[PDB]
């Protein structure tokens, strides 16, 4: 797909790694469902080591026309590791490891409610470091980029269905460990402006931050050029 002035919706490719386990696969299936219809996934494993050889990710990005990728790996050192990758011109832009804590919840852990597929989500970000810390700024950029879907000038009031909520697990001072990021999805309800109430639908993920790769200043200028 050739470059455009107004870009297509970013497409995401979910990649089970060699060490992907059953738990991680279930998490992958539920998180990738939230990105439908702009989502592809491999059924089989691939032996990818993103920080030692990013090459296979760049080829996958071009071959599958997906500028967003998530690799699933697990080790004792890095359990339930989701490596989120963005590309620019099919070359690696940034990467970040987000490891899912053992307290995760799947869609099946919440009472089933109707969910219209393909609606644009709302976002709420809770935490000052999302604006000021280089690591949390990348996380906010990534998740907005990843899930916002189609850009529109007209929003249907009736489609304001669900919210993606991301919360830093407490404030922190420089020098302290970087707190986890708490990922939640809620459906809206109301009662009589009406008062909004929320019901959690999942998945519920607590992300522990791992290693990062960031773009060179030249690539930043290119990728953010108007």
């Amino acid at each position: 797909r050739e470059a455009k002035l107004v870009e297509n919706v970013k497409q995401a490719l979910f990649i089970p790694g060699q060490s992907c386990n059953k738990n991680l696969h279930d998490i992958m299936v539920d998180l990738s469902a939230l990105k439908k219809p702009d989502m592809k996934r491999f059924n089989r494993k691939n032996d990818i080591h993103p920080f030692e050889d990013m090459s296979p990710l760049e080829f996958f990005s071009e071959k599958n026309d997906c500028s967003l990728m998530v690799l699933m790996t697990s080790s004792k050192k890095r359990k339930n590791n989701m490596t989120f990758i963005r590309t620019f011109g099919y070359k690696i832009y940034d990467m970040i490891e987000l490891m899912v804590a053992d307290n995760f919840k799947l869609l099946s852990d919440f009472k089933k409610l109707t969910f219209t597929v393909g609606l644009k989500p709302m976002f709420t970000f809770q935490g000052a470091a999302f604006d000021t810390h280089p690591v949390y700024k990348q996380i906010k950029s990534l998740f907005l980029d990843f899930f916002r879907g189609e850009s529109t000038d007209l929003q249907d009031v009736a489609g304001l269905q669900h919210v993606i909520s991301m919360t830093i697990q407490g404030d922190f001072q420089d020098g302290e460990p970087l707190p986890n990021v708490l990922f939640r999805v809620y459906k809206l309800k109301s009662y009589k402006l009406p008062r909004i109430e929320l019901v959690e639908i999942g998945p519920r993920l607590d992300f522990k931050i791992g290693r990062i790769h960031t773009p060179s200043p030249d690539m930043v200028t290119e990728a953010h050029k108007k």
């Binding site: 870009e7 620019f88 976002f123 009736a158 919360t167 708490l182 959690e200």
Partner: protein
């Protein structure tokens, strides 16, 4: 208590209020009530912002402003 910042073109609200790690600790029995409650307050404010935008009816549409968060393109400008 800083004011929430909005990026309505991305249907997004940003909340820079202080967060206490003791409320959100993995062992805190009420952490999910707290997270949902914070989210609910910010969603209420976001909805109030969205519902005060200019509207069309063709079914009712909001006229979203252009998104303001700096996000990288996936491909170079043609």
């Amino acid at each position: 208590g800083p004011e929430a910042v909005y990026d309505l073109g991305n249907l997004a609200a940003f909340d820079s209020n202080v967060l206490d790690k003791n409320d959100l600790d993995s062992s805190n029995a009420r952490r999910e009530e707290k997270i949902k409650s914070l989210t609910r307050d910010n969603v209420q404010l976001l909805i109030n912002q969205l519902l005060s935008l200019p509207m069309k009816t063709t079914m009712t549409l909001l006229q979203l402003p252009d998104p303001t968060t700096d996000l990288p393109r996936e491909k170079p400008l043609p």
